[PDB]
Design a protein around this ligand. Structure first.
Ligand SMILES: [Mg+2]
Ligand SMILES: [Mg+2]
Ligand SMILES: [Mg+2]
Ligand SMILES: [Mg+2]
Ligand SMILES: [Mg+2]
Ligand SMILES: [Mg+2]
Ligand SMILES: [Mg+2]
Ligand SMILES: [Mg+2]
Ligand SMILES: [Mg+2]
Ligand SMILES: [Mg+2]
Ligand SMILES: [Mg+2]
Ligand SMILES: [Mg+2]
Ligand SMILES: [Mg+2]
Ligand SMILES: [Mg+2]
Ligand SMILES: [Mg+2]
Ligand SMILES: [Mg+2]
Ligand SMILES: [Mg+2]
Ligand SMILES: [Mg+2]
Ligand SMILES: [Mg+2]
Ligand SMILES: [Mg+2]
Ligand SMILES: [Mg+2]
Ligand SMILES: [Mg+2]
Ligand SMILES: [Mg+2]
Ligand SMILES: [Mg+2]
Ligand SMILES: [Mg+2]
Ligand SMILES: [Mg+2]
Ligand SMILES: [Mg+2]
Ligand SMILES: [Mg+2]
Ligand SMILES: [Mg+2]
Ligand SMILES: [Mg+2]
Ligand SMILES: [Mg+2]
Ligand SMILES: [Mg+2]
Ligand SMILES: [Mg+2]
Ligand SMILES: [Mg+2]
Ligand SMILES: [Mg+2]
Lengths: 206, 51
RNA sequence: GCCCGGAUAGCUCAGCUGUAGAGCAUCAGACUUUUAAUCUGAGGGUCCAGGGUUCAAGUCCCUGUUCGGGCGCCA
RNA sequence: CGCGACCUCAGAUCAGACGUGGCGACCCGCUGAAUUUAAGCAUAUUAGUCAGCGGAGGAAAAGAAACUAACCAGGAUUCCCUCAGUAACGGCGAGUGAACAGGGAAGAGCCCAGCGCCGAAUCCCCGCCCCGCGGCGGGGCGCGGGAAAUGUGGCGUACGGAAG
RNA sequence: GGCGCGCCGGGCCCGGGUCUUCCCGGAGUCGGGUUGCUUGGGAAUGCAGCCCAAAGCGGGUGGUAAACUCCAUCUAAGGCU
RNA sequence: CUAACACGUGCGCGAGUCGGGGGCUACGAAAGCCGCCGUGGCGCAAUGAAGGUGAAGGCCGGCGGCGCGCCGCCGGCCGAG
RNA sequence: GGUGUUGACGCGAUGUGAUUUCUGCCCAGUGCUCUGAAUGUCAAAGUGAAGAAAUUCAAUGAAGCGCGGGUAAACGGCGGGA
RNA sequence: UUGACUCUAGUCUGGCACGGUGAAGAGACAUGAGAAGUGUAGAAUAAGUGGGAGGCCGCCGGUGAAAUACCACUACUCUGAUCGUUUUUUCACUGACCCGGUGAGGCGGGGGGGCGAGCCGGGCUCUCGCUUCUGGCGCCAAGCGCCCGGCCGGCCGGGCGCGACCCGCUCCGGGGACAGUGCCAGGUGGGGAGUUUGACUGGGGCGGUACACCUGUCAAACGGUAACGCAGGUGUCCUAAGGCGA
């Protein structure tokens, strides 16, 4: 689609905050509708994108780390999960699926995903909230920021999606570039291009 | 012929709309180009009915 | 070969998330002179095999034999 | 109803012009057979040939790429040597059959419509004056008539071009 | 007759480089289907009838039909020599 | 009689060969000349449908390798049945 | 354009050949004509599906064949053995 | 000539185009409006995805579950109906198109008028609009009204309108988006076209195959050797009737 549609629709949603002048932590969303994609047969898609714009920021972080993670995690307000706490929350998966419902996404240590698929790996891989693996930078600052906003474009059996991108206070050509990243990775993720999407919506939480 | 193709694109039958334009124009390249400009015309009509 | 249709206990069929049901045949009991006819009921499926989506599929989607059907060849 | 514009269309022994027909060796457009060959014959071959028809010129046609190429790239058309009896076509039978490249003959390029900007800046015709007149042309004057805005002329054409 | 030369009357008052801003193209045609002829041109080289009948980083060509994707090459459907 | 092919024979040159087409200078429209006019033909290379490939070898010295006495690779020698 | 300056007491297409007396039997065949509705077959164009597309496949199905009535002053035909 | 081969003008049928305007009938759809979303566990009639922390005066928890609850702005299916896209059948319309008539001569409305109907001189609906005893005649306007000019109320020649209504968009009728033509496709097609209609042979024809093969003979003791010489055979058959071993 041309970019001027994005420009006028997004400036109109900034001065169409006048609809409610909302009470909440304001953030907007994308919505997807597909043309003729078969949801049932093969090559169903699940593509995560490294978006470098972080449109969530009211975002919840709790991780699983090695050692050298203790002082830096308790310094910069990151929950260092030890292996004793891994076994503690493994003792009753009801409480960590509360914790999976408490916070948004997890982060994974280097080696302890043999300790995870003991019984808690199959226990809480049934939420879609699998932790993200570290790298050997061993520096979690901006690595958790490049773990967040890795957006899951997902094909489930219904022909509808919606992508949480956009909050009302961020910079504006960067918003239309954010949504441009969203739509071009969506269309290039699909097995067929722009004919395969019926109607892309950008309207807000209200 | 392009009105009838816009009816097929409004009902979103892209394959039979492409086969229709491919018969009643010529080459498959001209078929694809005219199908996509009719899709742009029909999208502009949807936005005109929107706001 | 081809979309297509099908598999369900020894034999015909019913049946979107579980007691696989309706009968036919067998087993054993009661009746009867005796399972001859009746009747009471039970036993009896790795749902053709496998993978996949799903909260789990005998049911949905694929894959793999096996058959039932018109065309394809042949004069 | 009458008058006046314009538009479509008629009649003139109206003023001025123009085409007809001929020859047709060479040339352009169309039509176009069967003999013949295949040891017969029907597809092919004869053959886009004979006959037919139309149209020109001193030459005609062609001609300045919606090209050849696939290279280190050439560069309108026409003609000759070659490519080559090759690639190819064909009851793949008989038979048919180019072009590119290269070497030569010759060699030449250009103009519109459109996009535009200039007070239609443009063209034809009648009358008079001067000149010249056996290729009716040059200069001047006409409150002379027309054409043309439903588009003439000047710049401009893909090699870009225009204005400041 | 033409090439040489002089005199009058009349036409034109013309160019090039750089920079900035503009502007740019030919349609029942191209192309496709089918049919007939022609071609060496072979899943159709050219021509024509009928039907469909466009586009503008478009369109044609790129000697085996077609899809995708790069390239290369010209600018058709107007005209003179 | 023209064209094509084959073989024989004469002539010139000979791994070459030929200007036939173009050009330069009465008989003579002949004749001569070109050579950075050999473009080109035919020959000098065959084979394969095609991608393609494309016409002697040996000996010496050094460095079963194992139940390449063959030899892989390097320097020399002989070198064309 | 002829029939046609015509209109079924006409135009056109056939057979047989005045009159008298008759004109028998056969619709199986080959024709001709009538009817479209069982199973068939059946073109291009149109429709749907599969595929990246050329293309492939399926469905529907005009007349004509098929199938079925009628007709011999239509072509023709019209037995034997004890 | 035809029941030969391969085709052909003609004709029959289908499709496309010229090729329209409506109204109903049957559908397929699109769209707006409206309710459905009862395996369980769960206060529960959870179809699904994605955001979401206070709308408005249930919820963030927690509870059981695979998955949760304000809002919206979405995408799927289902069930009645409004509305505009196409197909299809039928009935119509006139405008392309065809036919007929003519010296293209009174067409369609409306007005004005005369005979009938009944309701209390009245309007409406409908019809009519002047020619029938005769082998005659029939045009080139009488009459009315209003203007006008030449000569002196009188004379002579004029012009206009009613008579002969007005208004209109096809000259009137008959057909009609089918006839028809243009282009394809299928059928039919001795009406017409082009051609073919083997060979051997005691002439040719009919017969036969001596035309491709096989055995014995002929065949004269190598091989070879003929006629339509002689007596015969073949165009197959076999999962064993092939190959081993006993
Ligand atoms: Mg005159
Ligand atoms: Mg012959
Ligand atoms: Mg002969
Ligand atoms: Mg002959
Ligand atoms: Mg010919
Ligand atoms: Mg001639
Ligand atoms: Mg002439
Ligand atoms: Mg002359
Ligand atoms: Mg010329
Ligand atoms: Mg050339
Ligand atoms: Mg040669
Ligand atoms: Mg042959
Ligand atoms: Mg020829
Ligand atoms: Mg050349
Ligand atoms: Mg030269
Ligand atoms: Mg000019
Ligand atoms: Mg101009
Ligand atoms: Mg040019
Ligand atoms: Mg011809
Ligand atoms: Mg021709
Ligand atoms: Mg030919
Ligand atoms: Mg040009
Ligand atoms: Mg040109
Ligand atoms: Mg010319
Ligand atoms: Mg010889
Ligand atoms: Mg010799
Ligand atoms: Mg008779
Ligand atoms: Mg009789
Ligand atoms: Mg009969
Ligand atoms: Mg007879
Ligand atoms: Mg025949
Ligand atoms: Mg015939
Ligand atoms: Mg004949
Ligand atoms: Mg004979
Ligand atoms: Mg002997």
């Amino acid at each position: 689609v041309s970019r001027d549609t994005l420009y006028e629709a997004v400036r109109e949603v900034l001065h169409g905050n006048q609809r409610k002048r909302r009470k909440f932590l304001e953030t907007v969303e994308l919505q997807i509708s597909l043309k003729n994609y078969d949801p049932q047969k093969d090559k169903r898609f699940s593509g995560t994108v490294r978006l470098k714009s972080t449109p969530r920021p009211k975002f919840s972080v709790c991780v699983l780390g090695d050692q050298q993670h203790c002082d830096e995690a308790k310094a910069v307000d990151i929950p260092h999960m030890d292996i004793e706490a891994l076994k503690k929350l493994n003792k009753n998966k009801k409480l960590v699926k509360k914790l999976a419902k408490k916070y948004d996404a997890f982060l994974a240590s280097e080696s302890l995903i043999k300790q995870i698929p003991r019984i808690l790996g199959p226990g809480l891989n049934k939420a879609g909230k699998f932790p993200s693996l570290l790298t050997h930078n061993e520096n979690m600052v901006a690595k958790v920021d490049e773990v967040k906003s890795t957006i899951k474009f997902q094909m489930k059996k219904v022909l509808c999606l919606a992508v949480a991108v956009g909050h009302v206070k961020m910079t504006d050509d960067e918003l239309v570039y954010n949504i441009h990243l969203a739509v071009n990775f969506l269309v290039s993720l699909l097995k067929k291009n722009w004919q395969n999407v019926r109607a892309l919506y950008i309207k807000s939480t209200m | 012929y392009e009105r009838r193709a816009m009816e097929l694109l409004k009902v979103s039958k892209d394959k039979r709309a492409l086969k229709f334009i491919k018969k009643r124009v010529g080459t498959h390249i001209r078929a694809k180009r005219k199908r996509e400009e009719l899709s742009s015309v029909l999208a502009a009509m949807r936005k005109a009915a929107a706001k």
